[PDB]
């Protein structure tokens, strides 16, 4: 092997140019798709808001126009996935990981129109789901579209071009290029065998996709938190406790998402008309709470600057938390197109801030700021549920830019992923792909 | 293979408790070792300064005690490596990469005393070498020492504990925990086969190793650069040009270090006394240049804040660059224990600023600051020479804390690693392991 190694080492990082050029193309198209998806959801965001203004006197009428406007848009998303692209429901990240292990087909001719237009209705109606889901699976499918259009083949051309499209999709969804690459290597690569995902090609596609997102989004950040305080060494133990809380809640939440998928199926048994009429009922549910209590609904990026700055009362923080976990399951486990990734950032910050407020008034000698435990908890449920802690920590840091909190963010992230394992939890994305490949091959 | 897939996924990240606990102890000892190594070289550095003032009368005597104090310290380090630990010369990263592919032994009973005390002489005498080299190889061997002390076994226990020790070693050398983990993930894991390096265990050891160095160094940063300006979209093309320049220089520099290893060897042919007397001549050169022109010598971290702030003339930048390229080759290719990693950060920013200074006065409409291209070039020689671009940019960002430059830093990194590939270069660390594994066979 000594001889085989010597000529592997002297022949390393030599990605074929054909792949790198096509990595540039997929990232460009993923960026344009992600921007267009973002502007669309926002356009529906105020179309629906401007409707709330020709109706703002008749309080019954307005809670009516809120439900219906969001119910229809939701029903438009549930329908478009159940009738033309069943694997475009839910997140789509695990379906894209199945493809990378050659275990799921990527039907780009169907998933690209379905999840794009389906997600527009689901996210534009104000349900608690994230853009990450759509943009990664959309971005992956575009990787296979250009993988077919120019008929490149070879195992890597299939695997890389599909990987860079997925990374470009995560990057463009958060304006986080570093997190996009880390997600592929840490979570979305085939994780029990060697593969040829060319990292240099993933780099190319990520930059082009987020350059396109900065052509249409600069000067405004998704989340602005200011510069928080530093974390003294004698305070780190408090972040280890916070991770421990996240570490045991992580799996419990994982059982809920899975179990609620089952419970939600039995109400509709599976045929398309009962299903989409229940998607309209919770789609109208969240469009109503979207303004009777906005923090309960939506993607949740709105509350995070508010929660970090300690501008929420502790009573409300638990309300928002217990409301938002209810809202989160019933929207994601329903099968609606949209991610769970971003909603769990919101839940992480709300739980962090509550722990921080308690810490601030048991230890005045620590001179604490609740926000630092908001930032540390932001990525903690990602670490406990998804168990991609390195992505979670670099994503949170890319979006909040408080590098001085790297150790507390690292410690509660590892505390979360430590107790999630020792309490019998599983990576959510792997646990649902497993259940998807289990019933297809067991009860076929 | 769906049958094995479904329950491989259902068992993912199941790191044995024994490995993660012992990962914590490895990182604790790597941190303490790195701290002691850092304080030791600092103590010798000013011992040499305090000598220079009891000799500030006779300028000839003053250049004499500078040369010989560094010559003796250098000769000491060359001796202990050729006499007791031949694989503790140079960087030590390639040897730890061999060990992770089970193709080089980790003789911890010999290199840990040699590399520690040997590096103390080379770095304490003011040679152009980085502490990362020592700290990574020291940390890896410490990983196997407690592997052996408690004689745990399994492939993963050996590979993990050896990986976390190396990651803890890089983290403690730069106060960069994220880069330590990324370095294992991107560059030093076995790159042509699957392994089960447990990432969460690497995480644990990095945390404890980074806690240990901030117990003895808080409130002071290795390099503080301030907050620089942002990078407008219409200026990004300039960073790609800068990367292209690094991409052409990267391999050219890689050939020089390798070729200088050969040229320097013929001077001593292989003999321990002849070798150690040339190491004293290169050690005395740098202790002398250490007082006739400090920018020519030393690790180079001091000059990085100065260069970024545009406080050097273009003339001085060109002097420093070619001087430091000579001094860097003459110390690393000689076989002295010490890294090449940190010196190429110095070379990267100094050329970065030079490119910055020309750009600012060719495009006054861009309102540029030379420092932003200093930050982008900092990790660029790493990207072109080492071709671990994701570590370089996350490490540079960990040390400079100007996230607003991530896109230009990313663009200059990939332009470097693209043109290094297209001009027929190879990753330096892999090229040194290759030549090491080649002569371990050509002797048969």
């Amino acid at each position, epitope marked *: 092997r000594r001889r085989q190694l010597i000529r592997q080492l002297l022949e390393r990082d030599k990605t074929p140019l054909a792949i790198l050029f096509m990595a540039a193309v997929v990232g460009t198209l993923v960026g344009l798709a992600a921007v267009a998806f973002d502007k669309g959801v926002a356009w529906l965001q105020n179309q629906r808001m401007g409707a709330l203004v020709h109706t703002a006197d008749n309080y019954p009428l307005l809670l009516t126009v809120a439900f219906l406007a969001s119910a229809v848009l939701a029903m438009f998303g549930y329908f478009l996935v159940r009738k033309y692209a069943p694997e475009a429901g839910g997140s789509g990240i695990p379906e894209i990981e199945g493809a990378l292990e050659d275990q799921r087909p990527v039907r780009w001719w169907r998933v690209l129109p379905v999840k794009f237009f389906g997600g527009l209705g689901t996210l534009g109606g104000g349900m608690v789901l994230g853009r990450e889901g759509p943009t990664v699976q959309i971005g992956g499918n575009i990787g296979r579209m250009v993988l077919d259009i120019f008929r490149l083949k070879g195992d890597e051309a299939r695997h890389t071009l599909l990987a860079t499209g997925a990374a470009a999709g995560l990057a463009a969804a958060f304006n986080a290029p570093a997190a996009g690459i880390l997600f592929i290597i840490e979570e979305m690569r085939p994780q029990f065998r060697y593969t040829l995902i060319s990292i240099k090609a993933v780099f190319i596609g990520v930059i082009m996709s987020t350059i396109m997102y900065r052509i249409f989004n600069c000067e405004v950040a998704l989340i602005d938190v200011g*510069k928080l*305080s530093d974390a*003294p*060494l*004698n*305070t780190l133990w408090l972040y280890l406790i916070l991770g421990i809380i996240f570490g045991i809640f992580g799996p419990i939440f994982n059982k809920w998402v899975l179990g609620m998928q089952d419970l939600l199926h039995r109400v509709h048994g599976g045929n398309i008309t009962k299903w989409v009429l229940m998607g309209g009922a919770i789609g109208g549910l969240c469009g109503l709470l979207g303004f009777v209590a906005p923090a309960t609904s939506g993607g949740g990026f709105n509350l995070i600057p508010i929660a970090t700055a*300690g501008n929420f009362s502790m009573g409300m923080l638990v309300f928002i938390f217990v409301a938002r976990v209810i809202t989160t399951l019933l929207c994601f486990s329903s099968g609606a197109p949209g991610g769970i990734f971003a909603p769990m950032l919101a839940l992480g910050t709300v739980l962090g801030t509550a722990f921080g407020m308690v810490a*601030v008034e048991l*230890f*005045p*000698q*620590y*001179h604490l*700021e609740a926000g630092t435990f908001a930032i540390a908890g932001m990525g903690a449920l990602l670490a406990a549920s998804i168990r991609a802690p390195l992505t979670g920590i670099i994503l949170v840091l890319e979006m909040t830019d408080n590098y001085q909190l790297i150790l507390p963010m690292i410690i509660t992230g590892l505390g979360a992923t430590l107790l999630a394992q020792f309490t019998g939890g599983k990576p959510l994305y792997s646990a649902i792909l497993a259940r998807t490949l289990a019933k297809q091959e067991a009860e076929q | 293979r769906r049958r094995q897939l479904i329950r491989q996924l259902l068992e993912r990240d199941k790191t044995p408790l024994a490995i993660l606990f012992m990962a914590a102890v490895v990182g604790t000892l790597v941190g303490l070792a790195a701290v002691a190594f850092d304080k030791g070289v600092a103590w010798l550095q000013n011992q040499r300064m305090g000598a220079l003032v009891h000799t500030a009368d006779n300028y000839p005597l003053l250049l004499t005690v500078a040369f010989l104090a560094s010559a003796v310290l250098a000769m000491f380090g060359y001796f202990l490596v050729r006499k007791y630990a031949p694989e503790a010369g140079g960087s030590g990263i390639p040897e730890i990469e061999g060990a992770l592919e089970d193709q080089r032994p980790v003789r911890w009973w010999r290199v840990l005393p040699v590399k520690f005390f040997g590096g103390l002489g080379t770095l304490g005498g003011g040679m152009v070498l980085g502490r990362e080299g020592p700290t990574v190889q020291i940390g890896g061997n410490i990983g196997r020492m407690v592997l052996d002390i408690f004689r745990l076994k399994g492939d993963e226990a050996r590979h993990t504990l050896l990986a976390t020790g190396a990651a803890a070693g890089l983290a403690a050398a730069f106060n960069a925990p994220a880069a330590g983990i990324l370095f294992i993930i991107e560059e030093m894991r076995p790159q042509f086969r699957y392994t089960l390096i447990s990432i969460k265990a690497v995480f644990i050891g990095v945390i404890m190793s980074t806690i240990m160095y901030r117990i003895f160094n*808080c*409130e002071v940063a290795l390099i503080d650069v301030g907050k620089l300006s942002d990078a407008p979209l219409n200026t990004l093309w300039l960073y790609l040009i800068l990367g292209i320049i690094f991409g052409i220089f990267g391999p050219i520099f890689n050939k020089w270090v390798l070729g200088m290893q050969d040229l320097l060897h013929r001077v001593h042919g292989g003999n321990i006394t002849k070798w150690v007397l040339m190491g004293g001549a290169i050690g005395g050169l740098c202790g002398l240049l250490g007082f006739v022109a400090p920018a020519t010598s030393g690790g180079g971290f001091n000059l990085i804040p100065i260069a970024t702030a545009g406080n050097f003339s273009m003339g001085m930048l060109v002097f420093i660059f070619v001087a430091r390229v000579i001094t860097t080759l003459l110390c690393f290719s000689s076989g002295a224990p010490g890294g090449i990693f940190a010196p190429m950060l110095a070379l990267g920013t100094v050329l970065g600023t030079a490119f910055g200074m020309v750009a600012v006065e060719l495009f006054p409409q861009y309102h540029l600051e030379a420092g932003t291209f200093a930050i982008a070039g900092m990790g660029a020689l790493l990207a072109a020479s080492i071709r671990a671009p994701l570590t370089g940019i996350i490490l540079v960002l960990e040390m400079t804390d100007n996230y607003q430059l991530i896109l230009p830093m990313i663009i200059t990194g990939l332009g470097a690693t693209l043109l290094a590939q297209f001009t027929g270069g190879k990753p330096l660390y892999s090229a040194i392991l290759a030549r090491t594994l080649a002569k371990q066979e050509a002797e048969q």
Partner: antibody
Amino acid sequence: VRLLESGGGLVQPGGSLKLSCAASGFDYSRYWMSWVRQAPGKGLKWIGEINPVSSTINYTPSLKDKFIISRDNAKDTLYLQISKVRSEDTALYYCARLYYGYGYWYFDVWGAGTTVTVSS
Amino acid sequence: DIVLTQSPAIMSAAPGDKVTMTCSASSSVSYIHWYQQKSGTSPKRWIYDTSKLTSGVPVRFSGSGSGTSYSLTINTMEAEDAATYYCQQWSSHPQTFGGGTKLEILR
């Protein structure tokens, strides 16, 4: 890096006054500030602290609005108002920037002080 | 409130003597700081975290202790060390100051 306090001097018993501490040479925001006073010929006693955003304001155990501590980061100035002034308030008042090492906070650098004399 | 009681209120010493003053706490405290106040001068941070020297403090100074008993030591005092020294704690809120140890010089 200097802290120069003013506003000191004479107040009639029962009255009130506000001291100011003009900081310079360092980012005044992002720094916890504090007030310490020293009675004539005696030792030091903490008055209170305020965090950079004025969200947290702590005081030594005294009564109603005995002390109120305020800062305006726009002009890097610290404030302290004493009310219902009694003879125990005659002291040299120090304004001090706060910091820490391991996490147990100390009084980093001190101002020159400003005297207040409660007399009629 | 944790009250800290310091060694002698006043002590005399000749330059060259090893001098020790102690800070005793009513309850357990940790990582105590010391402040030097020369006559007519605002207190200046001297020793922090029980044992660390503020930059510029001559290394003839040292601190130690744990639990309820802490001390500051000048190994061979010098005449310029004449001042009043204050120990301070903030391991428990609210922070508190000792009464001060005034150091006088024999000559």
